[PDB]
């Protein structure tokens, strides 16, 4: 779960380049955050793990 | 692997849709050569009234 | 001092930077996701060649 | 049809290729004056953050070079040679006031 | 017949003009894998220079 957690933050931050909303920039692999954040373990299994 | 296999799947949907809309057009092609028999206009359209 | 100086050589140089490991996890999550999203589109496809 | 679906023939296969070539950290931007977005792997502050860093192979020779141990801070660099030139500095002068008294 | 083919064309459209520029990203020099560090110092290499 904590190895889950930490890829997908450092994942979504690759995908982030905390560039401006450019509302037009390619990302790579035409992956948005969302779909990082779908491969998160189940809600309770995150907040168990932070715990 | 996994996206190998996501490929192949891929390319035949893409070849199915080719395929199937080629299929689809020879509805529509009108045998000019009178000589083939086999090929019952579908279409009034394409009817020899 | 030059058993020492010696001994942490080697520590420096063992250094255990996984970073080839931690990347290839990086690669197969965004890849993984890739793969989900072009999954989509397949399928998206496929209702297209029934119709 | 025909045209637009040979455009999409092996798509995830190129697109793979193409990722599988990328270095990672590249994406990795961070922005110093608000403006410009640099990779970490370019800032300073990490060119002997990783043994795997591109330019960590000249600056292990640099410190080792003005005797500056790996495992201090990158910002010390500059600092510690400028205290090197004060030390020639004052290594010339007692050479010449000694010379001088001989 | 024909709205029906025309929308299965611009969603393979779409679907091309989006991995083309997908591909152009992924091509760009500064991404690509440990280029050999550069000899020549930088010009944005401000460290360095110092």
């Given at each position: 779960?904590?190895?889950?957690?930490?890829?997908?933050?450092?994942?979504?931050?690759?995908?982030?380049?905390?560039?401006?909303?450019?509302?037009?920039?390619?990302?790579?692999?035409?992956?948005?955050?969302?779909?990082?954040?779908?491969?998160?373990?189940?809600?309770?299994?995150?907040?168990?793990?932070?715990? | 692997?996994?996206?190998?296999?996501?490929?192949?799947?891929?390319?035949?949907?893409?070849?199915?849709?080719?395929?199937?809309?080629?299929?689809?057009?020879?509805?529509?092609?009108?045998?000019?050569?009178?000589?083939?028999?086999?090929?019952?206009?579908?279409?009034?359209?394409?009817?020899?009234? | 001092?030059?058993?020492?100086?010696?001994?942490?050589?080697?520590?420096?140089?063992?250094?255990?930077?996984?970073?080839?490991?931690?990347?290839?996890?990086?690669?197969?999550?965004?890849?993984?996701?890739?793969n989900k999203k072009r999954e989509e589109e397949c399928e998206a496809?496929?209702?297209?060649?029934?119709? | 049809?025909?045209?637009?679906?040979?455009?999409?023939?092996?798509?995830?296969?190129?697109?793979?290729?193409?990722?599988?070539?990328?270095?990672?950290?590249?994406?990795?931007?961070?922005?110093?004056?608000?403006?410009?977005?640099?990779?970490?792997?370019?800032?300073?502050?990490?060119?002997?953050?990783?043994?795997?860093?591109?330019?960590?192979?000249?600056?292990?020779?640099?410190?080792?070079?003005?005797?500056?141990?790996?495992?201090?801070?990158?910002?010390?660099?500059?600092?510690?040679?400028?205290?090197?030139?004060?030390?020639?500095?004052?290594?010339?002068?007692?050479?010449?006031?000694?010379?001088?008294?001989? | 017949?024909?709205?029906?083919?025309?929308?299965?064309?611009?969603?393979?459209?779409?679907?091309?003009?989006?991995?083309?520029?997908?591909?152009?990203?992924?091509?760009?020099?500064?991404?690509?894998?440990?280029?050999?560090?550069?000899?020549?110092?930088?010009?944005?290499?401000?460290?360095?220079?110092?």
């Amino acid at each position: 779960g904590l190895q889950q957690c930490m890829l997908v933050s450092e994942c979504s931050r690759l995908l982030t380049a905390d560039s401006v909303p450019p509302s037009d920039s390619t990302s790579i692999l035409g992956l948005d955050k969302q779909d990082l954040l779908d491969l998160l373990p189940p809600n309770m299994l995150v907040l168990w793990v932070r715990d | 692997h996994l996206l190998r296999v996501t490929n192949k799947k891929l390319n035949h949907e893409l070849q199915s849709i080719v395929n199937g809309v080629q299929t689809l057009m020879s509805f529509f092609s009108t045998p000019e050569t009178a000589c083939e028999l086999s090929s019952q206009p579908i279409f009034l359209s394409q009817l020899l009234l | 001092q030059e058993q020492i100086q010696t001994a942490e050589r080697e520590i420096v140089g063992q250094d255990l930077n996984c970073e080839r490991a931690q990347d290839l996890c990086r690669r197969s999550l965004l890849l993984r996701a890739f793969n989900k999203k072009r999954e989509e589109e397949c399928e998206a496809l496929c209702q297209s060649n029934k119709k | 049809i025909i045209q637009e679906s040979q455009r999409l023939q092996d798509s995830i296969q190129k697109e793979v290729k193409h990722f599988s070539a990328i270095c990672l950290p590249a994406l990795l931007k961070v922005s110093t004056d608000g403006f410009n977005l640099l990779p970490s792997r370019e800032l300073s502050i990490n060119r002997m953050s990783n043994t795997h860093a591109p330019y960590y192979g000249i600056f292990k020779g640099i410190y080792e070079s003005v005797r500056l141990p790996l495992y201090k801070a990158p910002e010390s660099v500059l600092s510690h040679v400028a205290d090197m030139k004060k030390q020639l500095f004052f290594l010339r002068s007692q050479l010449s006031s000694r010379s001088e008294a001989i | 017949v024909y709205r029906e083919l025309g929308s299965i064309v611009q969603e393979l459209k779409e679907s091309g003009d989006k991995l083309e520029e997908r591909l152009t990203m992924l091509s760009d020099v500064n991404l690509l894998s440990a280029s050999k560090p550069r000899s020549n110092i930088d010009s944005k290499d401000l460290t360095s220079h110092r």
